[PDB]
Design a protein around this ligand. Structure first.
Ligand SMILES: [Cu+2]
Ligand SMILES: [Zn+2]
Length: 474
């Protein structure tokens, strides 16, 4: 007998095919059958009429490394239908690094002495010992490796430093990491050369991981950053994932046409993937950057002046008698939200075929960017349903089957007999992102229930207490 059958709903199986009326049977951690299951014995037959049953959403771009440990309920993500998270992005991973004051943007993961894992394997063991509510596919970050090896980060690494970083990367991958990420845009790695990055990432071909990247520049010099990324992919001969694709700054508005054309061409000759969040504002460490700071900027948290969280930087700057750019140093370390993208470009990038959905949520932020809480329903509701940017099955494919395939998460991302039971039950008519910039932590509407490895982790708008997630391997 099946443990339960979700009956009477519409299944969107994650293979980018129109939904069809069918029941979904689960036994243990597996989807046992799909179709008319009235003839199958089941201990429970849960009515989901008027709802869609789809694979659980896989967040391809998270900074949940530490959150998985400190808040195992993972409410920001399971309340949106997320069943799996990809961690250690943009060169930022929690492990391996024992440091009481890691350099920004590594502090985006810190809750105070959180960087305590000497080996990447120690981090994975901690997750397995006290599992979170969602599955975790973890990458090791190049900036974290630099911080752990180099005495001085403002320069290229020596051969000895590269050998040390490479060994850590290899141990991480051997322990289960699914890839290595870089973020040369940030201070910790702004001085790393392309050759340094290639050498540190050599273990990816041996272990079969992916190379993920927050490109060196996403504005005026984004073409060069794209070419650097494609070059790295060819040198290593491994898949590359371009993180949170965008064109930032008014002088680059509309350039997604040009960037998407370059990516499409590269995909014809080498393995390339990309993801994006559905908003016109980004968020990361507060930084002295003329383009990030050109438009509306909001403080998400501030170490030296905590009372600044939630304030407009222009106001803070003006009242201190300085430009936003000049006032940044005295407010650091801090985080911010930057309104530097244009809707037309965001829509173009989301609609581009291969683009996967990634929230880029910064979970420790005092006053976070709403993407932390609304990303997936914003795509399913606002964009698919209300704006008609793509049909519902394609919006679902972009957060399930496509993502599972690009990251090599076997037996997940599809409602198929034999696959793992990571599932979401949502009302297609009401699913919506409730989080706004003003109230960034509101729970999404229309998410009925979420299941991870067969266990319900979200029901009646609340975490069930089931710590059902698993550390995954590629
Ligand atoms: Cu990131
Ligand atoms: Zn990034």
């Amino acid at each position: 007998p099946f443990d339960y059958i979700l009956s009477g709903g519409t299944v969107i199986d994650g293979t980018n095919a129109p939904g069809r009326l069918a029941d979904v049977g689960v036994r243990g951690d597996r989807i046992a059958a799909v179709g008319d299951l009235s003839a199958s014995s089941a201990r429970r037959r849960i009515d989901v009429a008027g709802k869609v049953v789809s694979p659980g959403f896989i967040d391809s771009h998270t900074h949940d490394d530490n959150y998985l440990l400190k808040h195992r309920d993972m409410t920001p993500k399971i309340s949106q239908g997320v069943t799996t998270v990809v961690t250690g992005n943009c060169g930022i991973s929690l492990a391996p690094l024992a440091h009481a004051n890691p350099p920004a943007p590594l502090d985006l993961l810190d809750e105070g002495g959180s960087f305590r894992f000497a080996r990447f394997s120690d981090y994975l063991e901690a997750l397995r010992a006290a599992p979170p509510a969602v599955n975790a596919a973890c990458m090791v970050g190049h900036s974290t490796l630099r911080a752990a090896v180099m005495p001085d980060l403002r320069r290229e690494a020596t051969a000895d430093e590269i050998q040390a970083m490479q060994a850590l990367a290899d141990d991480a991958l051997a322990s289960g990491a699914i890839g290595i990420s870089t973020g040369a845009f940030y201070p910790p790695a702004a001085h790393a050369s392309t050759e340094e990055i290639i050498e540190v990432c050599r273990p990816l071909i041996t272990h079969g991981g992916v190379y993920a990247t927050h490109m060196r520049d996403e504005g005026e010099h984004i073409v060069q950053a794209l070419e650097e990324t494609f070059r790295i992919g060819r040198e290593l001969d491994v898949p590359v994932v371009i993180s949170h694709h965008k064109v930032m700054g008014k002088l680059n508005f509309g350039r997604s046409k040009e960037t998407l054309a370059l990516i499409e061409a590269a995909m014809a000759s080498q393995d390339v993937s990309l993801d994006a969040y559905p908003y016109v504002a980004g968020s990361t460490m507060l930084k002295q950057d003329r383009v990030l700071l050109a438009g509306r900027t909001l403080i998400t948290w501030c170490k030296p002046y905590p009372e600044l969280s939630g304030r407009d930087l222009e106001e803070i700057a003006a009242e201190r008698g300085k430009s936003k750019y000049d006032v940044v140093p005295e407010l650091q370390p801090a985080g911010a939200i930057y309104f530097m993208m244009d809707e037309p470009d965001v829509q173009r990038i989301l609609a581009f075929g291969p683009t996967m959905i990634g929230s880029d949520g910064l979970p420790h932020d005092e006053r976070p960017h709403p993407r932390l809480w609304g990303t997936f329903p914003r795509v399913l509701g606002h964009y698919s349903r209300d704006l008609g940017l793509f049909p519902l099955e394609t919006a679902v494919w972009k957060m399930t089957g496509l993502t599972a395939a690009k990251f090599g998460l076997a037996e997940r991302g599809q409602v198929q007999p034999g696959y793992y039971a990571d599932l979401v039950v949502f009302d297609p008519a009401t699913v919506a992102d409730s989080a706004t910039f003003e109230h960034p932590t509101e729970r999404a509407a229309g998410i009925h229930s979420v299941y991870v490895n067969g266990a319900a982790v979200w029901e009646d708008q609340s975490f069930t207490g089931q710590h059902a997630g698993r550390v995954l391997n590629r």
